[PDB]
Design a protein around this ligand. Structure first.
Ligand SMILES: OC[C@H]1NC[C@H](O)[C@@H](O)[C@H]1O
Ligand SMILES: [Ca+2]
Length: 345
């Protein structure tokens, strides 16, 4: 595992799986990610999939979720498809893919999460629906008093004033988006011990993280959700659970530029969360080693976890590389990550 180098599949082609994540099923790891083009930023293809027995040799499984050729479809060619994650639904036996969708020709405005389904890990997946999250429902931890407040859009046009920040903290953008549902851009998924799944996403114009419970088949949301770190600008969330504790690594919001990772922790997924120091340590840790969090893969057979990131090259996004590093734990059980040029499982 040689972070930042050109990685190739078994045919010799550059692995094209960005913003991704990995699952294990029937003896194989399946890596899902954005198919990025050589020029431009929008996918020409959809969500790509690769498979491996060993986490070193990756076989191209082809496109798992394709862009549609039908005009007016939510996922017609030219839509934005980012940060795909796949989870297995044990009750129905289906593979469920969620992803950040922006409708074609609308930039990043729609701020939707989309959901697709497959009988097999590699696909093809069948698109079901897209939309903002939980129309009509308030966050669980947004208080009665906060829900009763009125925010005149004309008084709060200037971002980053003291009164605007306070307003964002007390849920001004939640109320703004209440009817049509909460915004979802950068996102991930987590399947808990009891089969409860959660959709974690940057919401409220990227200012605030939200964690939403998924329904029992993982195809919709239940209405139950919380919001955390309002105004915190936590992006590209990555999550894992260890010995009952939930840990989340995120980035800041500086477009393509690498920035300082944050470490967030809770004892309950929908309980209170708190922020801990940058979990990256050593030289370049202030820049997350030139990367941005995408996924934390548990290896539950070994009681270990590994941190996946993207080393984004905005000049040509197909040339973006992959940083994969062991998650280590200090004497208090707090995760940290150090660079290694080459390491083995
Ligand atoms: O918009 C480009 C880029 N910005 C930063 C996000 O974390 C990425 O997923 C991607 O949307
Ligand atoms: Ca955020």
């Amino acid at each position: 595992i040689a972070s930042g180098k050109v990685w190739r599949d078994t045919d010799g082609n550059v692995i094209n799986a960005h913003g991704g994540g990995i699952l294990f099923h029937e003896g194989k790891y399946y890596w899902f990610g954005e198919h990025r083009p050589a020029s431009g930023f929008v996918t020409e293809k959809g969500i790509n999939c690769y498979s491996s027995t060993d986490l070193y040799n990756w076989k191209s499984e082809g496109i798992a979720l394709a862009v549609s050729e039908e005009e007016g479809h939510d996922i017609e060619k030219g839509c934005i498809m980012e940060r795909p994650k796949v989870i297995y639904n044990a009750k129905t036996g289906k593979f469920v893919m969620w992803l950040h969708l922006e409708l074609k020709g609308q930039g990043y405005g729609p701020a939707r999460a989309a959901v697709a389904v497959s009988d097999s890990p590699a696909g093809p997946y069948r698109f079901i629906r897209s939309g903002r999250v939980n129309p009509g429902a308030y966050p669980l931890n947004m208080t009665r008093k906060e829900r009763k407040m009125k925010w005149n859009p004309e008084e709060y046009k200037e971002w980053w004033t003291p009164k605007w920040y306070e307003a964002i903290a007390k849920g001004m953008f939640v109320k703004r988006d209440l009817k049509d549902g909460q915004m979802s851009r950068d996102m991930t998924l987590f399947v808990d011990d009891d089969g409860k799944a959660y959709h974690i996403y940057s919401s409220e114009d990227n200012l605030t993280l939200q964690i939403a419970e998924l329904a029992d088949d993982y195809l919709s949301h239940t209405g139950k959700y919380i919001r955390i770190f309002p105004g915190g600008h936590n992006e590209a969330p990555a999550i894992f659970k260890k010995e009952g504790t939930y840990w989340m690594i995120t980035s800041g919001c500086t477009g393509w530029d690498p920035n300082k990772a944050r470490l967030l922790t809770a004892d309950s997924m929908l309980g209170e969360w708190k922020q801990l120091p940058n979990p990256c340590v050593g030289e370049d840790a202030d820049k997350t080693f030139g990367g941005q969090s995408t996924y934390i893969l548990p290896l539950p057979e070994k009681g270990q976890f590994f941190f996946m990131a993207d080393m984004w090259r905005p000049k040509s996004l197909a040339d973006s590389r992959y940083i994969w590093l062991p998650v280590q734990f200090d004497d208090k059980g707090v995760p940290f990550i150090k660079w290694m040029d080459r390491w083995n499982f």
